[PDB]
Design a protein around this nucleic acid. Structure first.
Ligand SMILES: Nc1ncnc2c1ncn2[C@@H]1O[C@H](COP(=O)(O)OP(=O)(O)O)[C@@H](O)[C@H]1O
Ligand SMILES: Nc1ncnc2c1ncn2[C@@H]1O[C@H](COP(=O)(O)OP(=O)(O)O)[C@@H](O)[C@H]1O
Ligand code: BEF
Ligand code: BEF
Ligand SMILES: [Mg+2]
Ligand SMILES: [Mg+2]
Lengths: 457, 439
RNA sequence: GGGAACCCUUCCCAAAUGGCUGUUCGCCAUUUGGGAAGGGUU
RNA sequence: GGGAACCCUUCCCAAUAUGGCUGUUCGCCAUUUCGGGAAGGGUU
């Protein structure tokens, strides 16, 4: 039985679901905030990165859901589309105990009409970005009149000056009689001091201080701005990370670093706001399932993204905000693992490095690189097939896996992550078998129907 | 005397060629008389006998005022039955071939409301509808008559009866006050004629034929008891051996009972009444029209408007309550210049109905003696109907589906019906393969 | 700077809504989905 | 009477309409239907 039983609130169906999902022990933040959340209290939570906040507020809000009432009862706000999709997926996993629970995500990039159509049957839980959610609110396709609880993940980001007007506009559509949860790994005392405007007598649950990170080893390298790309290529060759995320402060630098890494054959994809949304989603899929070694991103990937066993984070340029520095490195060392975060520091970034040293109360570990080091190739172990259909075509992972193991004649150990999206299914297969799987699935059949299959770039 | 459509001096050469292609060689009397005033924009109330071209008479008039570039509703036509609405729409489509990209939509019950709502996003130029579903669409804002030029009521004496009065009034409140209004019918009791002027604006009354001037229909009456009508009917069918026949009854119960009594004696008979599924009604009409059945037993849902080509025989199993309904029934035969036969049964209690018919038509009844009472003869259907899934939404023009072993081809919105000689397994078209059912 | 939204064009591809000759395998027309590329919004 | 429209219930069949469900497939459920039948009730 799972430790969650000590809460003495969750139904046995949810306890069994947690046991099946492997949630055998409550993380500190779950143990600390779930009583108060299930009691209906407003909370502002500060726990370290990759320590279970999603389940912390998800179990809480799921406990107060009436599946028979097809109106929206829970609303979760995220700062980026990929993070919205991610926490929506985790909530759907946590909601298996309660059958026929509709969890819908509302972000830009998707066409507005398909979402308007899916909203005719109101979803129980909405996970959303502020722009598209406010668009749907002003046009009367979403009602918050039945809203029990409103969650703001990355709440210090949702309450900054950028999102402030959009948030104030959204809350105007929400009841005053609502539970309001705020979760983050960082709380600048400014955003913390103003956060009371959206809550009603909240409990401050600050279990992890600002300097209490997960087991992340940090290393800093002095370098001129011009030497950074050579140094990055040499360091990637030295470390040989199974996966790595490189962060830049601008999309121009992001794409430039991606291209410079690819010209030396270090398998790299780029993720920033100028990409189309299909490209953003597919890029994240491919990096997560092993179809690329390095992901180069702007701060659109700094927060919340849960990439499993990510081995390395590199700060090409230190982030403007030390809070964002903490979130970047937090992409590694999640769910109890360790990680490494290398950071470059040019003379213009001295102030950023000093503020990081002060905030984390650590003496920075400056590494000198080897005198000479060659540049090595980094090839991806996997490649991603994109099958047309998704949840709209009722494709569950068992169908793709059984078709791959049987009819097409592929080994069960040559297929990695299966990610079922609303309109497509992404499969990871080893690079040797990729073209074979593509050609045979072309004229093959999954779940009886014949489908369209693309090999992603 | 003959008059060509060019004598109207209004119709474009495209429309003149279209009429010549469709076999409208010379105008009928109702066309020659009503079309000048209709094209001049006058409201008209028109009488003309059955099977004399009233449909084309008002259709050409309203098509002359359509602007195909403006994709709003500009012409509305109301019908008493769904099958008649479909038929009038089809004739209007054939007449509208001179005008490319002309949307004529039919709004009737039985068909789902959602597909019609979707089709209404691109507003049609012409709507042919029954008042129920049309009013349902109007009140729900899916149809707008703001740009309406012409409103037409076929079978207007029925459209203005007490049953349809309120629905019609409801529909008119959505239409513009400045509109052209055309009322057409084969019959006009002077009471309903007097009340009809409320929907019109200075109408012109054109009574082409006096009430007793019918098409060349031979009328024969038979005395019979109530029971025994079915035996006498079976015997008359065995005697005359009609290629196509229509049997009218006053009740759906009698209709279905007569239909099944005809079927159990081996006489191919279909039924048509309001208690049927709408797909069933449409398929029944298609099968009876293309020759897949010899006899059609129907209620007064088939009394008005329907144009079955070269229908050979009509019988009144029971005389209609109203003589106006009687003339509409027999009018199903002897259409477009053909002759016909109309046999009527007369029980003791319907004798006064027979007498009122005699007075209205100013004809003395020709009573006939019963022929014989032996050997119920067979009446096999010459054709059989197959249903292809596809229709107009699958872009199936008749030529695609397409010798002389196949009769009529009926291209519907969702299906295509074809009559073959007395195909399925070999078909089970236009590149794509399709589902085929045997009716 | 980085996210989070949108409007204005202007051409492709595909599909909703119709039109087109009783010897098929297609051609139009309007609309809306992305595929773009052009400018503008917070 | 006969048409032209519904509304209640209450069971079928159907709908990638809207969702839910085991990582060795070809399926199983839920709601809605401005989708079709049945079987009683009513209404215009
Ligand atoms: N109780 C638990 N036991 C084991 N794993 C857990 C537990 N709770 C969460 N996880 C997993 O650990 C990771 C933490 O993800 P996340 O919820 O995003 O942490 P955070 O939002 O605080 O950064 C996820 O993969 C989550 O599924
Ligand atoms: N001018 C014409 N020449 C030849 N046939 C015609 C002409 N006008 C109509 N018809 C045909 O004669 C029949 C009359 O159908 P219809 O117009 O509905 O008669 P009704 O006057 O009773 O409404 C139909 O087959 C129609 O196509
Ligand atoms: F704090 Be986590 F990475 F959302
Ligand atoms: F008068 Be007809 F038969 F429409
Ligand atoms: Mg998180
Ligand atoms: Mg007529």
């Amino acid at each position: 039985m799972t430790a969650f039983s000590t809460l003495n609130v969750l139904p046995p169906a949810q306890l069994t679901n947690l046991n099946e999902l492997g949630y055998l022990t409550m993380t500190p933040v779950q143990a600390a905030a779930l009583p108060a959340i299930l009691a209906g209290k407003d909370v502002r939570v500060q726990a370290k990165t990759g320590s279970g906040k999603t389940a912390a507020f998800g179990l809480g809000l799921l406990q107060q859901i009436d599946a028979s009432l097809f109106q929206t009862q829970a609303l979760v706000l995220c700062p980026t589309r990929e993070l919205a999709d991610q926490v929506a997926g985790e909530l759907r996993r946590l909601a298996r105990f309660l059958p026929n629970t509709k969890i819908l995500t509302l972000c830009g990039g998707q066409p507005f009409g398909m979402q308007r159509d899916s909203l005719q049957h109101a979803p129980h839980i909405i996970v959303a970005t502020p722009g598209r959610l406010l668009d749907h609110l002003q046009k009367g396709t979403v009602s918050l009149d039945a809203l029990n609880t409103l969650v703001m993940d990355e709440a210090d980001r949702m309450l900054d000056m950028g999102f402030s007007d959009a948030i104030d506009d959204v809350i105007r559509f929400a009841p005053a009689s609502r539970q309001t949860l705020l979760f983050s790994a960082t709380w600048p005392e400014a955003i913390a001091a103003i956060s009371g405007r959206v809550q009603r007598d909240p409990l401050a649950i600050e279990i992890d201080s600002t300097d209490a990170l997960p087991p992340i080893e940090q290393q800093f390298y002095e370098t001129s701005s011009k030497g950074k790309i050579p140094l990055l290529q040499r360091l990637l060759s030295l470390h040989q990370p199974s996966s790595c995320v490189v962060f830049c402060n601008t999309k121009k630098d992001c794409q430039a670093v991606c291209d410079a890494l690819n010209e030396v054959g270090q398998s790299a994809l780029s993720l920033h706001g100028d990409l189309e949304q299909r490209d953003r989603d597919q890029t994240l899929v491919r990096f997560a399932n092993g179809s690329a070694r390095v992901l180069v991103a702007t701060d659109v990937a700094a927060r919340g993204l849960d990439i499993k066993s990510l081995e390395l984070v590199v700060n090409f340029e230190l982030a403007w905000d030390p809070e964002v520095h903490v979130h970047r490195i937090g992409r590694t060392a999640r769910a109890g693992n360790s990680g490494l975060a290398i950071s470059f520091c040019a003379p213009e970034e001295a102030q950023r490095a000093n503020i990081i040293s002060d905030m984390l109360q650590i003496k920075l570990n400056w590494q000198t690189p080897p005198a000479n080091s060659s540049i090595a190739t980094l090839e991806a172990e996997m490649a991603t097939l994109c099958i047309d259909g998704g949840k709209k075509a009722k494709m569950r992972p068992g169908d793709v896996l059984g078709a791959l193991t049987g009819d097409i004649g592929l080994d069960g150990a040559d297929i990695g992550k299966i990610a079922v999206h609303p309109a497509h299914v992404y499969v990871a297969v080893r690079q040797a078998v990729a073209h074979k799987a593509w050609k045979q699935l072309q004229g093959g059949k999954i779940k009886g129907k014949t489908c369209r299959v693309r090999l992603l770039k």
